[PDB]
Design a protein around this ligand. Structure first.
Ligand SMILES: Cc1cc2c(cc1C)N(C[C@H](O)[C@H](O)[C@H](O)COP(=O)(O)O)c1[nH]c(=O)[nH]c(=O)c1N2
Ligand SMILES: Cc1cc2c(cc1C)N(C[C@H](O)[C@H](O)[C@H](O)COP(=O)(O)O)c1[nH]c(=O)[nH]c(=O)c1N2
Ligand SMILES: Cc1cc2c(cc1C)N(C[C@H](O)[C@H](O)[C@H](O)COP(=O)(O)O)c1[nH]c(=O)[nH]c(=O)c1N2
Ligand SMILES: Cc1cc2c(cc1C)N(C[C@H](O)[C@H](O)[C@H](O)COP(=O)(O)O)c1[nH]c(=O)[nH]c(=O)c1N2
Lengths: 332, 332, 332, 332
């Protein structure tokens, strides 16, 4: 378990992306402005509350000493910046109750803390996770291709739909059905909606790939590294659901313009893993806090240049698609 | 004859592909699964029988000492893995009855063995081939451009249609009209169907090119190396025929995902030559058997990720096309 | 102020363009000609007068010693060639009345001289600018993204629309609403038109980028370097306005064919900054005059090859679009 | 005059093409053949006669010692192979009656000889050309952009239409209106047709460019090197005229497949300059004759692979377009 956690960190950081669907989106700007920078509002709503900011640190780690170190650093960045921080899968702490790598709330009482568990875990373990972590939301992840590429992975999936119904019926905090970089498909969103799920994380291809990661671990099956749908394609494919389900978007988000692009297409908020992980591995925590504060300023200036005074206003922004996104749209 | 056989092997392995149409197909996956890996069924039907697996070793060699060696190795892989193995053209053994390079059945009694002859050969030779080889099916190949690029090649083709009618009327095993990498066109499929042919191998461009090979042998006419239609284009062009004729697909199949892509478009099974030839030239036979067993596991996991419990289910999978395939579809 | 002016010159010249939308436009020529070269007329009309030529030197500099040097050289080229020369923003001279870097008219009495001020400056400063410079027109620039990327930049924009109304009502020379390389959007043109603006400079992306420049100065935010719409995209997006507002076009104009392409789409005239700046930095003033004279000859020969005897005739020329421009047109 | 002729040869051979529109055309082949190679007929009709073969050596040279050498070699290739050979512009021999570089008929009595003159020359000179050369046809070339890029070039074109009417009315051999690599436009074809012209050479962009050549000579104006329409685009744009005017096609023809592609779109015959010039500069005349004989064999084999027994049959061949040709077709 501990070695897998550290290999995930290692190989995620090693990965080099060669395609990012955000680069196939162009926004039509506004030459003549309407607003002052100081009036631009960054707030959004999802999972039963209003949030000051429209981006969050997405599920990564916990379950090893390196995970403990990373989680402490992420918790400090998140608390200081007033943003949501979701830990990696809590399963490691269920198997080893001595594990203190997820225990960041005690020292960070103002932290907005979410946590994460796999849909393969029975609802009893989800309940235990929520009871132990007291999170603001629970991500319930779906990672079929990752499990199948792992020698130690799950092989039976018949129970997952029944599990999802159980989580929806029993978990006392908001649940977010959570992809892991393969891009959540519309049929899955429909099924989740039917079970009562009202928030999803589309987490698509373009950034971290767990096919790449598990294939580095196994040394096999590289031909599957580009499995799934890109982040923008998953978001475009989900448009019919954008007002019935809260769409959180992640996967290859590098910068505030990528965030804005998600919001233009009706995302409620935008998650980052690799970008933030790399920052914490490269700079001091104080420096990372400065960068994240800078992201807020960048969001406001981009919105100002788009004549948008609120996050909701972004959905009115006109755009052009190119390349693969455009070719795919021709077929939809 | 023997030198041509060995040059075919040499130049086929030397060839480097720069375009593969499978890379212009994207499958829409399923984040929320339905099935257990152990319930995924790989069986298919064509040429009058049910097959345990949906891929086969396609026609290559025989007629030289190297061909004998390769055929023994392929027969061992095929028998061990329970898959169809089709020999190269049997004409060499008709011309030289001493040739034992095709005689793999005697030592491999559980082998599913097919064989191959050119449509230029009169039906009497086809009958002799079937009588001598006792195959489960007979591929009857069409290779006009290859013949024309060969100094020793055929120059008269008026008789080929009459030959095809003869084979259809007289051969007592199922016949498969077989392309050799130029991509079987729809008009040919229609004509074949009219004669009573019910199974074809579309074998398109993207993998081994016999224009490339014969042009290496002759040192001339490289400008024809990309003759014909790509494997995916031939398959898409054949869609109107997919339920009146059994479409077998080959040409540039590298891995199990390429196989799955063929099946998504209604192929009954998928043939491999170069990929398997390279494996047998690189690894021990035992190692190749392991790789092929691994392909079965990979097919099941890809199907699981696509929520497909049977081969037939794959035809329901949604997709996106890009690049040349997309541009061509715009014109169809 | 002086250091910013010189950094603008430095970084503008350092910039290397990797995309130019003019290269995605193809003109259908005429094999059989109609006209003599000596009868081709280059005249155009905008901002209340007829001009002998359809290109001009666009706003750049003034406000430093290097700016004084450059402005003297540009004034000599412009006067000798009978073309419009627009200075950079005059704000530096408003803040420092000792500044003589814009004072080129006194030595060049036949110069067609325009000047420039930011829309952030109250109309009283615009009036002072016009009174001091006696220009043939006043460009009023909009540069929101540039201001936001500058540490010393504007942060309040609520007043800009009211300013534009004031300038339209009060300035006694023609005004041109002026982009700075981000590509003026159609909604801005509509708003400007409503206020009484009748001439705009679309100045789009493809040549000098002030995102690139300010980001070089700050060392941050390179992910915004390609902000805005390309020159051709802005021109195509403005087609509904081409006969209600005079469209001047600039941004990445390299040569006379780029000029012709703008005119084919109904521009009244074409502005150049970087190309002319680089010429004056590379060659003697006498040599630059020769090159600019050569541009006139080139315009005539291109028009002759297109069977166009006047600038207006160019709007009848047929064309093909490719790449991004074509993909964007598919979406409009 | 002599130095210009030799510079044309030099720079034409130096040129490297980076785009060839023939590479954006794919032909749908026939897997099941109908015909014998020995029954495939290569004959065609244009300019008042039947021709044994559908390709010709297009206008190049004459007017210098090197031109005399090249013309003797081309005449020997053409006579031996039974194909049309068109000399370069005869104007040099009109200005210098001592010039013997075009005098190839006397030694080659079975030669099919055409000649060439510019439309700028009055009909009296065209008549003198035909009287002196006794050609089977007269190409009358249009090269406006080339003339304009030449320091010694024509500057007055008002007379060209009247000249064309004169040539049509007076010249006693068939006339071919002849482009020089810029791609003859449909409006020109219409005008020519109205004057009585019934054969044109579309000579488009993709091979030799006289913009490139004249710009190498002058050292200026490289930005015009890609002027005009590609060979395939000119041919596609001319489709409405293909049965009212005989379309000869040239420009970047490299090999027999390029020839076939022209014929698929209704060309009567296909011209080659650079390819044949390079052959004569690289190989012995005997070797070039072998290569050209080989082209005939290649045409037959390609036709056989397309189930075409005659040149006319090629117009029934199905195709796919890609890239720029496809994008342009989307706009037509
Ligand atoms: C090191 C590491 C570890 C994990 C992850 C990522 C990384 C980088 N991810 C997946 C993550 O939340 C996200 O879906 C993808 O990484 C895509 O986003 P980025 O491109 O990395 O921003 C993840 N997802 C999840 O739901 N539970 C988890 O425990 C983990 N573990
Ligand atoms: C060495 C070798 C030899 C042969 C072949 C191939 C190779 C590699 N192929 C063609 C083969 O069955 C298939 O159509 C193509 O090779 C395309 O598939 P791959 O891209 O190689 O998988 C072949 N086809 C056939 O019908 N009869 C034959 O005798 C042969 N001979
Ligand atoms: C050195 C320098 C300085 C300035 C500029 C440019 C350059 C190169 N530009 C912007 C200019 O007018 C034009 O909009 C862009 O440069 C795009 O055109 P080019 O691609 O450079 O031809 C400019 N624009 C403006 O309205 N007022 C100004 O003061 C300046 N300053
Ligand atoms: C050395 C040389 C000289 C000439 C030419 C070409 C070359 C290579 N070309 C143009 C020629 O006929 C043809 O239109 C173009 O060269 C395009 O065809 P290729 O791409 O070269 O096959 C030519 N055309 C013409 O009508 N009269 C001429 O005198 C000449 N001169």
């Amino acid at each position: 378990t501990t070695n897998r956690k550290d290999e995930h960190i290692l190989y995620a950081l090693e990965q080099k992306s060669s395609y990012n669907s955000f680069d196939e989106v162009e926004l039509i700007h506004s030459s003549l402005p309407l607003y002052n920078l100081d009036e631009i509002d960054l707030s959004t709503e999802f999972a039963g509350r209003k949030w000051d900011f429209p981006f969050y640190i997405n599920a990564m780690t916990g379950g090893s000493n390196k995970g403990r170190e990373i989680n402490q650093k992420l918790a400090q960045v998140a608390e200081s910046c007033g943003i949501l921080f979701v830990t990696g899968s809590y399963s490691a702490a269920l198997k080893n109750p001595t594990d203190d790598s997820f225990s960041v709330k005690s020292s960070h009482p103002n932290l907005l803390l979410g946590t994460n568990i796999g849909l393969d875990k029975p609802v009893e373990l989800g309940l235990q996770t929520v009871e132990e972590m007291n999170p603001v939301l629970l991500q319930v992840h779906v990672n079929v291709m990752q499990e199948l590429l792992m020698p130690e992975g799950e092989r039976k999936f018949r129970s997952w739909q029944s599990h999802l119904a159980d989580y929806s019926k029993q978990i006392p905090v908001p649940i977010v059905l959570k992809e892991v970089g393969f891009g959540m498909d519309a049929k899955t969103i429909e099924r989740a909606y039917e079970f009562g799920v009202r928030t999803v994380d589309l987490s698509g291809r373009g950034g971290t790939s767990f096919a790449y990661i598990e294939n580095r671990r196994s040394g096999q099956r590289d031909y599957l590294n580009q499995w799934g749908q890109s982040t923008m394609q998953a978001l475009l494919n989900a448009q019919e659901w954008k007002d019935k389900v809260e769409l959180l978007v992640s996967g290859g988000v590098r910068n505030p313009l990528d965030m804005i692009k998600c919001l233009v297409f009706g995302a409620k908020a935008v998650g980052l893993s690799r970008t933030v992980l790399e920052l914490v591995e490269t700079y001091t925590v104080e420096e990372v806090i400065g960068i994240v504060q800078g992201w807020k300023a960048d969001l406001r200036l981009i919105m100002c240049s788009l004549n948008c005074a609120t996050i909701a206003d972004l959905q009115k922004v006109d755009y052009l698609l190119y390349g693969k996104l455009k070719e795919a749209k021709d077929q939809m």
